[PDB]
């Protein structure tokens, strides 16, 4: 409120690192819900801050294009494609990440999860993001992709390089970003070559290499889609694992409700994904002049769907700034988007988060045993809404 409406830049990454962006999004929802920003680190853009207006953008891909770039920050892959090619590639890829096709690998993830939790320090403060969230998410991706186990830290590195702003401690330049992602393409090409001329067996690289429909992708599209699948489920799962522990500590009546009725994992996991909003936005580009929420959008304009604001919109969600683990309709949220691009991995991602909560409560069943003892450090990004560290002590 101490700055002019016309000067609000909700994309400033410092607002996300400082956890001060909430107040700026609240002012826009009240006073200018479809908002033009002339000056930012990302050039000019529109902010879409209400639940119903994000739904209008998601459901009109013939007006609001995904082709070529789906973030505010300026290989082919089907998230960054419009129909018809989007729809052909999604129909090939959807069965690869469906739980119905993954039961044996998911039982192996549960065994590996239990072993990892059995190795955590007890009655000693540690960094939850390092020892649990990054550790378990990397073990899950390495299991699904049968990735060489000694090289699994490369998955975390490639994830960081894909999304990082220049000068945050990950890359020094766009030249460095391109050199590292060349390395990623070279590594995945070797795995493709080692699995295509041998009988399949049970991992996602073997499944894609032997799927007849994926012969109609170019090698560039095949590699682009393979790398989308490794990166797409990494930071999102990681920051949902961290967020749930923080939400239960900030809301002790919900931690008591969970421990008294562990079946509430079913309604809690979707509420963790809403409360966290691990990807704060997705971007579109206007293909035609259009009207949205009373504003004139021009052909070629950058249009930002702020899920971080839509998930807190009281017009759509009752008491939206409260964490409530037994809501009547807990899947009413925008963290997986909506429409033709709605997260193809959503049911697999939630299954992983339920496996983790079942295995945590098996070992530590009482309220307050998983205790946040220090402030989180947050990520410097307008896209990844997440945590670099979280000090935790397990009281057992
Ligand atoms: C194993 C893979 C994988 C996992 C795990 C995964 N995703 Fe996705 N996600 C994708 C793919 C692939 C797409 C592209 C789908 C498309 O464009 O049709 C996608 C698309 C999305 C989109 C775009 C929605 C839209 O309407 O534009 C969002 C947002 C998203 N994912 C969020 C999440 C979140 C949050 C999580 C975890 C809590 C997650 N994803 C877990 C693979 C994954």
Full set of structural domains in the chain with CATH: 5-394 (1.10.630.10)
Q: How far is the C-alpha of 57 from the C-alpha of 337, rounded, in Å? A: 11
Query: Mutual orientation of helices 252-260 and 235-250 as an angle, nearest 10°?
Result: 100
Ligand 1 atom nearest residue 339's Cα: 26
Nearest to 132 by CA among 372, 381, 383, 385: 372
Experimental method: X-ray
Q: Within 10 Å of residue 209's Cβ, how many Cβ atoms?
A: 20
Q: How far is the C-alpha of 311 from the C-alpha of 275, rounded, in Å? A: 7
Q: How far is the C-alpha of 212 from the C-alpha of 196, rounded, in Å? A: 12
What are the C-alpha distances in Å from 133 to residues 121, 230, 244?
Answer: 15, 16, 11
> What are residue 37's DSSP bridge partners?
45
The verdict on the CB of residue 237 being under 6 Å from ligand 1 is yes
Start-to-end C-alpha separation, the chain: 46
Q: Is 90 annotated as a binding residue?
A: yes
Q: What is the DSSP string of 53-85?
A: HHHHHHT-TTTEE-SS--SS-----GGG--TTH
Choose which residue among 102, 232, 305 to substitute to test ligand 1 binding: the one with the highest number of ligand atoms within 8 A of its C-beta: 232
**What are residue 72's phi and psi, to 5 degrees?**
-70, -25
Query: Mutual orientation of helices 346-363 and 235-250 as an angle, nearest 10°?
Result: 50
Q: How far is the C-alpha of 216 from the C-alpha of 212, rounded, in Å? A: 8
Which residue has the CA at smallest separation from atom 8 of ligand 1? Answer: 343
The verdict on the CB of residue 383 being under 6 Å from ligand 1 is no
Q: What is the DSSP string of 251-298?
A: -HHHHHHHHH-GGGHHHHHHHHHHHH-SB--EEEEESS-EEETTEEEP
Question: Is the dihedral angle over the CA atoms 312, 316, 322, 327 positive or is it negative?
Answer: negative
Nearest to 226 by CA among 200, 190, 197: 190
Radius of gyration of the chain (CA): 21
In the DSSP assignment, the letter for residue 164 is P
């Amino acid at each position: 409120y101490a700055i002019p409406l016309e000067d609000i830049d909700v994309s400033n990454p410092e607002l996300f690192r400082d956890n001060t962006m909430w107040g700026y999004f609240e002012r826009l929802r009240r006073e200018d819900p479809v908002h033009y920003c002339k000056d930012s680190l990302f050039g000019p853009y529109w902010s879409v801050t209400k639940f119903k207006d994000i739904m209008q953008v998601e459901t009109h891909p013939e007006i609001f294009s995904s082709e070529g770039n789906i973030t505010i920050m300026e290989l082919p892959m089907f998230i960054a494609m419009d129909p018809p090619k989007h729809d052909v590639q999604r129909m090939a890829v959807s069965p690869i990440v469906a739980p119905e096709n993954l039961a044996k690998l998911e039982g192996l993830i549960r065994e590996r999860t239990g072993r990892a939790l059995d190795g955590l320090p007890i009655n000693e403060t540690f960094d939850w993001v390092k020892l649990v969230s990054i550790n378990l998410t990397t073990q899950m991706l390495a299991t699904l992709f049968d990735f060489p186990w000694e090289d699994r830290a490369k998955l975390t590195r490639w994830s960081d390089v894909a999304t990082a702003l220049v000068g945050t401690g990950i890359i020094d330049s766009e030249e460095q970003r391109m050199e590292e992602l060349k390395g990623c393409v070279q590594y995945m090409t070797r795995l493709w070559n080692e699995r295509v001329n041998v009988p399949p067996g049970n991992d996602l690289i073997s499944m894609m290499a032997h799927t007849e429909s994926m012969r109609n992708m170019t090698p560039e599209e095949f590699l682009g889609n393979l790398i989308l699948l490794i990166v797409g489920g990494n930071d999102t799962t990681r920051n949902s694992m961290t967020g749930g522990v923080l939400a239960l500590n900030e809301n002790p009546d919900e931690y008591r409700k969970l421990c008294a009725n562990p079946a509430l994992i079913a309604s809690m996991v979707p509420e963790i994904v809403r409360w966290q909003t691990p990807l704060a936005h997705m971007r579109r580009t206007a293909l035609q002049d259009t009207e949205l929420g009373g504003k004139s959008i021009r052909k070629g304009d950058k249009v930002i769907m702020w899920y971080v604001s839509g998930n807190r919109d009281p017009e759509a969600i009752e008491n939206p700034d409260a964490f409530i683990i037994d809501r009547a309709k807990p899947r009413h949220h925008l963290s997986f988007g909506f429409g033709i691009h709605r997260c193809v991995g959503n049911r697999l991602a939630e299954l992983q988060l339920r496996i983790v909560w079942e295995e945590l409560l098996k070992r530590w069943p009482n309220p307050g045993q998983i205790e946040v003892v220090g402030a989180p450090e947050r990520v410097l990004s307008p896209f990844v809404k997440g945590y670099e560290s979280l000090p935790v002590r397990i009281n057992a």
